[PDB]
Amino acid sequence: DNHVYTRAAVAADAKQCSKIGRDALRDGGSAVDAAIAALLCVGLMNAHSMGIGGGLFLTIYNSTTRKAEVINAREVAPRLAFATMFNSSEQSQKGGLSVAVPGEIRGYELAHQRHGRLPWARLFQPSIQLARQGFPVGKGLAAALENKRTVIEQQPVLCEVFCRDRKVLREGERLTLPQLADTYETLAIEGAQAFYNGSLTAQIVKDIQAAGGIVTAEDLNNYRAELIEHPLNISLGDAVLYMPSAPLSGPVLALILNILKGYNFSRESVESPEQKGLTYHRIVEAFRFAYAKRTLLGDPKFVDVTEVVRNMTSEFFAAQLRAQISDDTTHPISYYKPEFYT
Amino acid sequence: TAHLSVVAEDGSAVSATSTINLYFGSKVRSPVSGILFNNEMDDFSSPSITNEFGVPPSPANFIQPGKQPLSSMCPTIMVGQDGQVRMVVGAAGGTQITTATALAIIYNLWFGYDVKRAVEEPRLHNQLLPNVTTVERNIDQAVTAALETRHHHTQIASTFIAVVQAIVRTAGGWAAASDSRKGGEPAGY
Ligand SMILES: *[C@@H]1O[C@H](CO)[C@@H](O)[C@H](O)[C@H]1NC(C)=O
Ligand SMILES: *[C@@H]1O[C@H](CO)[C@@H](O)[C@H](O)[C@H]1NC(C)=O
Ligand SMILES: *[C@@H]1O[C@H](CO)[C@@H](O)[C@H](O)[C@H]1NC(C)=O
Ligand SMILES: *[C@@H]1O[C@H](CO)[C@@H](O)[C@H](O)[C@H]1NC(C)=O
Ligand SMILES: *[C@@H]1O[C@H](CO)[C@@H](O)[C@H](O)[C@H]1NC(C)=O
Ligand SMILES: *[C@@H]1O[C@H](CO)[C@@H](O)[C@H](O)[C@H]1NC(C)=O
Ligand SMILES: [Cl-]
Ligand SMILES: [Cl-]
Numbered sequence: 171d172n173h174v175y176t177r178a179a180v181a182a183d184a185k186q187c188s189k190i191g192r193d194a195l196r197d198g199g200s201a202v203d204a205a206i207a208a209l210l211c212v213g214l215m216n217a218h219s220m221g222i223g224g225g226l227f228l229t230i231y232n233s234t235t236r237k238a239e240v241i242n243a244r245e246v247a248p249r250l251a252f253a254t255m256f257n258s259s260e261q262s263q264k265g266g267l268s269v270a271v272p273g274e275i276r277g278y279e280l281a282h283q284r285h286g287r288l289p290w291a292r293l294f295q296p297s298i299q300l301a302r303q304g305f306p307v308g309k310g311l312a313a314a315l316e317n318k319r320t321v322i323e324q325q326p327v328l329c330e331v332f333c334r335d336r337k338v339l340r341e342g343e344r345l346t347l348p349q350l351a352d353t354y355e356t357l358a359i360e361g362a363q364a365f366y367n368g369s370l371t372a373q374i375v376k377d378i379q380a381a382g383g384i385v386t387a388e389d390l391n392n393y394r395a396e397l398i399e400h401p402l403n404i405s406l407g408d409a410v411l412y413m414p415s416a417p418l419s420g421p422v423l424a425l426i427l428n429i430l431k432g433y434n435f436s437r438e439s440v441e442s443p444e445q446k447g448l449t450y451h452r453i454v455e456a457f458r459f460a461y462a463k464r465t466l467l468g469d470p471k472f473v474d475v476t477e478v479v480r481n482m483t484s485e486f487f488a489a490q491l492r493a494q495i496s497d498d499t500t501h502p503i504s505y506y507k508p509e510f511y512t
Numbered sequence: 513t514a515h516l517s518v519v520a521e522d523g524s525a526v527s528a529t530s531t532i533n534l535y536f537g538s539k540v541r542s543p544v545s546g547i548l549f550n551n552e553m554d555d556f557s558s559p560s561i562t563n564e565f566g567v568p569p570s571p572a573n574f575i576q577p578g579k580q581p582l583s584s585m586c587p588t589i590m591v592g593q594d595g596q597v598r599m600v601v602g603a604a605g606g607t608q609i610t611t612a613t614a615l616a617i618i619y620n621l622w623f624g625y626d627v628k629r630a631v632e633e634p635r636l637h638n639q640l641l642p643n644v645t646t647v648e649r650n651i652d653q654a655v656t657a658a659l660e661t662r663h664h665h666t667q668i669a670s671t672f673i674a675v676v677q678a679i680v681r682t683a684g685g686w687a688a689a690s691d692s693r694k695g696g697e698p699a700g701y
């Protein structure tokens with residue numbers, strides 16, 4: 171309708187998954203239950219984007235405890251991976267060797283153990299039906315299918331589900347995911363264990379390695395989703411913003427907003443073309459300064475980013491960068507001091 | 513990548529961004545399980561690969577066994593001083609996630625745009641390397657002009673820049689928006 175709601179809301183990139191999230195809330199689920207049910211659905215309707223073969227982060231806020239937490243369930247490099255394992259973009263983009271260890275299901279399981287109210291199997295139920303019954307291909311997926319027409323049509327295993335008469339499905343056409351339905355059912359019934367150390371594990375390893383990868387059962391056995399009790403935050407006026415730290419881009423977002431807050435943007439900032447143009451120029455300059463520092467970030471378990479992140483979340487640091495933003499001109503790359511070593 | 517935002521009736525919230533990386537990830541689908549495997553290894557830097565003219569590898573983001581690759585993802589929840597959620601926001605779209613998320617926040621929190629406009633409003637992006645500023649097709653061309661007169665070279669995104677899902681607390685309750693660039697719609701009660 172209008173999409174203002176008096177009690178609860180789910181915003182997902184497919185209507186049907188937002189609905190599935192909403193129904194979960196309605197049936198008494200937590201915000202986490204709803205997110206998981208919706209996420210499982212998005213893995214189907216926007217299968218090009220995300221799903222149980224990938225990884226995720228969840229930022230979670232509890233209005234009772236008033237605490238925020240983060241769940242890190244991003245994929246990890248397999249135990250056999252090494253720095254020089256790839257020599258071309260193609261090698262790092264296509265095939266089994268490009269696959270990192272999927273965190274998705276562990277992530278759902280950790281979030282659900284900590285905050286779930288519905289049973290685990292209930293979160294899968296609606297998506298199991300969706301994948302068996304099929305659904306019209308939506309706008310996002312149809313454009314992705316189009317964008318990747320060649321590779322899909324040339325690869326029998328993808329064409330198997332993503333084609334109709336050996337050409338990529340188009341918007342409105344029915345997409346059915348019968349294998350995933352079966353896999354989702356197994357997950358619903360056997361739990362997360364089935365993926366990481368159970369009835370799916372050997373097949374997963376075999377598929378990845380058959381495609382030239384190096385993921386092993388051990389990799390899956392050993393994957394752990396991680397609880398982050400103290401996520402990044404920044405103070406913005408009377409609000410606090412919780413977001414993930416490295417290895418995600420919280421620090422980058424933090425530096426952008428902290429640089430820009432010293433200008434005190436308001437409705438007036440965009441009222442006239444003179445103000446609007448300066449405002450946008452200033453935004454682009456904050457982007458450039460923030461991305462200059464981004465190249466120092468990495469997995470904080472493997473690289474020491476403590477001070478880098480301290481600077482990026484420091485308002486004083488931000489004010490120093492804001493002071494080098496010239497209102498009348500942008501600058502060359504070196505001006506912003508991008509760094510590749512500390 | 514996909515982002516989604518959730519606020520429950522009790523005022524608890526989830527902002528979650530999830531990804532298999534490129535469209536259809538690695539292009540490896542299990543013929544048995546149906547699982548479509550990520551190509552997240554591509555988010556690492558490699559000393560041997562050059563992605564962009566004059567952009568060096570970032571050794572802080574080299575592959576190590578057990579290491580997680582750098583991500584642009586930044587699922588965010590903004591909470592007011594009273595402990596109530598004010599905004600649940602994030603984006604999909606590679607390196608454009610972080611700038612798009614900043615934009616959605618700026619638009620709602622500072623420019624005063626309601627959540628749907630904050631999501632739908634034209635976006636732009638610069639990530640330093642490469643040097644160019646990318647603008648969406650329907651941006652206010654007075655912005656384009658103010659950028660170019662200040663020596664930004666701009667270019668127009670052939671499709672669109674990022675995908676944002678967002679929820680904002682209003683007097684009437686929770687206003688929700690899904691990005692028309694990808695075709696989502698919200699749902700609630
Ligand atoms: C790339 O080159 C390195 C160094 O010789 C080698 O160890 C590795 O196996 C190669 N990888 C690929 C995917 O071609
Ligand atoms: C928040 O924390 C409180 C107190 O520990 C707990 O009772 C409640 O269920 C939690 N709610 C959510 C939505 O996580
Ligand atoms: C399951 O877990 C145990 C303990 O980690 C391990 O030794 C066993 O081999 C695993 N089974 C499968 C099927 O991965
Ligand atoms: C923000 O993070 C800092 C550093 O851990 C900490 O001092 C504080 O508890 C956090 N602020 C809020 C409002 O949670
Ligand atoms: C942090 O910023 C200060 C200047 O404010 C600078 O001296 C120092 O080099 C920075 N530290 C890092 C790791 O960038
Ligand atoms: C990048 O763009 C800016 C703005 O036009 C310009 O000054 C500079 O010469 C360009 N090149 C580099 C390497 O910074
Ligand atoms: Cl399938
Ligand atoms: Cl999305």
Ligand code: NA
Pocket residue numbers: 172173628688689690698
């Ligand atoms: Na809306």
